From a paper:
Using Arabidopsis thaliana Pdx1, an enzyme involved in vitamin B6 biosynthesis, and lysozyme, we demonstrate crystal scaling to suitable dimensions and numbers for time-resolved serial crystallography. Here, we report the use of droplet miniaturization for the controlled production of uniform crystals, providing an avenue for controlled substrate addition and synchronous reaction initiation.
We show that with diminishing volumes, nucleation becomes improbable, but this can be countered by seeding. Pdx1 and trypsin I droplet preparations required the use of seeds within the mother liquor. In droplets a 2:1 mixture of seeds (107 ml−1) diluted in mother liquor with 12 mg ml−1 Pdx1 was used. Droplets were collected in microcentrifuge tubes and stored at room temperature for 2–3 days with a mineral oil overlay to prevent coalescence. Crystals were retrieved from droplets by a procedure called ‘breaking the emulsion’.
Numbering used by the authors:
A (entry chain D), B (entry chain A): 22 to 290
C (entry chain C), E (entry chain C): 22 to 289
D (entry chain B): 22 to 291
Amino acid sequence: SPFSVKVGLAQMLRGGVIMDVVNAEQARIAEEAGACAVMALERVPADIRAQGGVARMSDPQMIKEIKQAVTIPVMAKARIGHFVEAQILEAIGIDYIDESEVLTLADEDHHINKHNFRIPFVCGCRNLGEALRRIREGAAMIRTKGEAGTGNIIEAVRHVRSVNGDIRVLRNMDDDEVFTFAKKLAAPYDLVMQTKQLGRLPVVQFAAGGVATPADAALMMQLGCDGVFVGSGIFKSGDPARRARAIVQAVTHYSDPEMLVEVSCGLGE
Amino acid sequence: SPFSVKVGLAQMLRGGVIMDVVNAEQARIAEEAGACAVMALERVPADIRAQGGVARMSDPQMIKEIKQAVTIPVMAKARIGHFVEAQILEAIGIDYIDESEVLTLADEDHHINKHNFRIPFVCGCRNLGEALRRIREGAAMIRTKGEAGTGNIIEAVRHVRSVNGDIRVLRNMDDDEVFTFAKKLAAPYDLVMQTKQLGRLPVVQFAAGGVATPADAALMMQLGCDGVFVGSGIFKSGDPARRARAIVQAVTHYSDPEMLVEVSCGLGE
Amino acid sequence: SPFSVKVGLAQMLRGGVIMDVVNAEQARIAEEAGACAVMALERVPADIRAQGGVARMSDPQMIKEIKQAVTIPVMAKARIGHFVEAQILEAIGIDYIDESEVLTLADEDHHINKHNFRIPFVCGCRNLGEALRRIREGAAMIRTKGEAGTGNIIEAVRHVRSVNGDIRVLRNMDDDEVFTFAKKLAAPYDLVMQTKQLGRLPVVQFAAGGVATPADAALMMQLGCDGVFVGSGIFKSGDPARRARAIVQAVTHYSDPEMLVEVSCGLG
Amino acid sequence: SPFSVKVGLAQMLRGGVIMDVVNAEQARIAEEAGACAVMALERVPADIRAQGGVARMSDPQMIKEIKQAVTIPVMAKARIGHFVEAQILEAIGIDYIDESEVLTLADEDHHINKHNFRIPFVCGCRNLGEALRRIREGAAMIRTKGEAGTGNIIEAVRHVRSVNGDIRVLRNMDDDEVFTFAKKLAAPYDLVMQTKQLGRLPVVQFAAGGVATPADAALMMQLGCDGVFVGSGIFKSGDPARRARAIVQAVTHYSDPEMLVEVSCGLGEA
Amino acid sequence: SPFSVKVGLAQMLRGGVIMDVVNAEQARIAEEAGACAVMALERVPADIRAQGGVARMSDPQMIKEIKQAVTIPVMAKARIGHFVEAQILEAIGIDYIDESEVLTLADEDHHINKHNFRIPFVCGCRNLGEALRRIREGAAMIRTKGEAGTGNIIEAVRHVRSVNGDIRVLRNMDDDEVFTFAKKLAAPYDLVMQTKQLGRLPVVQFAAGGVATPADAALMMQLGCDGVFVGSGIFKSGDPARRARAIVQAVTHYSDPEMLVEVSCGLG
């Protein structure tokens, strides 16, 4: 199927860090630091909503500038339910679309039908039911919603523990009880049973929302995530090439404390 | 698959009436009157609960007596969730098992896993979500729950109108909106989409609970059911061979008022 | 009847974009960009209420200036229930009146009896019942209420999905059940049954409230609208001839992503 | 320890049926039918409470009569918290004491400290937390509370599914999360961790309350119980030797439908 | 076991005062004044939250600077549930980690599994049940939560009285009733029974949160604590060597009023 092709594409990002960037310079620092992809963003939605504004797709022009500055894959955000924003992003020729709750919602009741597109989608989740719903709609990659813009890891930890915990429950559960379990999650039975056989989520699972330090990033990997997203706070500090590199190093050497000491040392705020 | 074989078996009952019987005599009147099957019952559960008692599987002995008295298929009731009652009924060699809410519940949270059996199951439903849940668990045939023991048709009408109404909604619905619809029904998406393509329920749908007169039975057929169940009230009146025949005639000639007048005439109490 | 004449007039707008304008200059940019009509407005009601003021009919003088600047149809707003504001708008000789919830309400319980006028009316709606009520009162054209002044498309999507969804339900429904359905919508049965036979609304249905980008406009067309209204935000940016043209292009080529990329590029 | 000795004794009951009896005749029918033990009871507590009465320990005399009529182990009920009733039962020389919620409660806040006795105890439970609390107090054997006296199996199924379900959850759980899990169950952490390693309850687990038919008994075994208790309803029907034998046969052949047909056939009324 | 080794290490601190420091200078004044250990802190979390910020592990660099300035043990804070912050603190080679509610929480449902580490941990508590839960997770040392940042001793007194009071109840209690008592505390029975036999907490118990004066510190010792923590308020006054020494003197001579007068005199 073309679904398993999209799932396969997203697997190449396993073990990587994805960085939000607002210009080609940032994009280049990110690539040099060893990011596996970048996320294009004309303004951080934190700061548009701070001013009480609507946050939408970025201008295709600035996305094109970033696509040219780098050789790593490029992602961009569409509003939830805004399938025409997604059509535009596909036609520009980027690599992944993020149907993102950080932008202003466009449809209160329906997500994009992601099976109608050739490129893969990322969606967010707080729990296993939500993740399986996004996958059935055609998401090829899942991240935690966390809590964007705060630098606080609490919500991201809750979401990872929740998803992984339910998978563990499901793996060992009496088969006869799975029907009721699917009902309570409001999730498709067939994907529930498949998650039981795999013993893990059928797609890559990244952490996102509030990852601020090397320790944060390594924690997410130790809890069982496949990779991490990081926001543009990286570029508000002193040597942003150093802070970027540090987070990549942390995800790569997530189970080596000695390495984590080295990259954390003298990082400033 | 063996599932579609079970579905196929249940289809040969289309257009028929199924009668509850408590002995071989009743079973023979039923067969002679033109019933497509009988439902074996040592006591009516109405009257065991009337006395405040527990209603269970019938004694296998009396089921065997009925199986021998007739050449039409024989059905029997198991308590919801009581998979060992069902194993016994299968081993006796009857034709259909009804996982029945009219008997005392055995498991408050789980139905029988009906895929683990070779013979087909009937389950009840009040709405489309419930029906699709029973089917995914492996029911090959659906009936309305109605309201057993009252002779009042109102609950049965509510349930038929509900199921058929949601199927009509589903048939014409924007495909992108079906994901949310499946969530709200708490039903497996894949069976929802299949119901949309067929434009009807993937299994036979019978009416049950409160059918008392030829007019009642014909109404159910005019509302789009595939057949009807009838309780043992027909054996509590005069010439029960006449009352039984009348209901069969009504279901067969459900759109001929002249016929319905003839069979309804002078039917007594 | 003169009702079907008004319905026919409103159908000429199918496929078009309608732009709010505050002067003759704006009106001309709109016409040049390919707007099918303009909506005359002395001030945006967003900003009169922002100051806590009452928003009423525009001065007839400035409406006359706009009517002379252009050859496309001109629309104007009357307060809900203010049938004398409407009489004045008719006598000026504009083409369409919008009985508008964006202006301050004049009658809390009654809309204008729109059958007593020669020119066609637009009304807003949030759902099918509301739309059918407005039509029976004599609206010749329907738009979503959406959410005016915010640039947020969410309310408009809710309204379109709601109306279209109920029409799809109605189309396939057991005829015997339509009586109860009409009661629950609080709508005239005869218009419900007519909507069932057509399989769509008996009048043109436009989207309005929060359309800000080419993508927004195209989305509304892909969801099944007949056209779109757009506010004066278009004229607050650079090269407003470019932004205006972009939205027209988007509605015209609404199912061509390649086109949508081109018009969306470098817009701000 | 003497605790693990008591646990060991109770293993010999695995695979068996335990029957309530009110006299030596009933006790003999039970033994002949193949019961692994009997539970002595001067009256069914169902029927003493039916009359609104207090239900206590049985007269030691009638317990002695039953102990002599049979060669299988004999159990008897003590009221919850009534440690002197238990002392008496121990001194009579029976085999097991059931600290039973079917009798009238004697202490609303405290169970018997079962470690102060030489003979093993049975306790009831509705969930895993309750079971582990009873074990730490020194129960050597656990049963479901179910719902005694109704012939309705639903409460017993709820309790078995609950206990077994939590054990399965626990077996696979991140070790770091077990601290919070113990807190929420209000159960001793050390017994929780032990239950995680074994992958089952550290003691024998029987079903009780509402088992009325061979099918009921077999269902309990298929759900993972080690055995079943059955009340004196068995003796209120025709040929009670037949109904008793049938339930034993069902527990013995619990995964053979053909056998279950044979024993269920023509059993008369319950 | 290595657990009893950690318990033994924490006992060397009995009778002492632990001071929060933000630099090597402060650390040296503390050591000279007779502090039994220091707690390294790049900023007081009071003032990061005052600004509405997240409070995390300190930069390992500044911790290393403090570790080099002094020969007494050095402690540092990790966020609750952040076991990787703790791994980093272990690898730097400090002596004690404080899993601290004064920093921003990282895991709402789980504390660190402290048995997976070689160095000893401090945890906070408000009551006996909470203390026993922290110990079973592997804390080697307990402090009151008190109320950080206020200089108000009331919460600390509540917590000490609570813990000590329950231990006194437990010591004399009918053994048969201890099962129910363990359930109500939601604490492991085996640690409850051990606390009953000792007649005190199986680990050292310090007071923390709101200790501001020599009298405060002495009160905590008279109520039965084994030692006290003190914040960086000490360093915001004149001659902070004098204020530091005063608190050490108070804890050392906690039942001598004459001494307490002398050290309290003219302190500000």
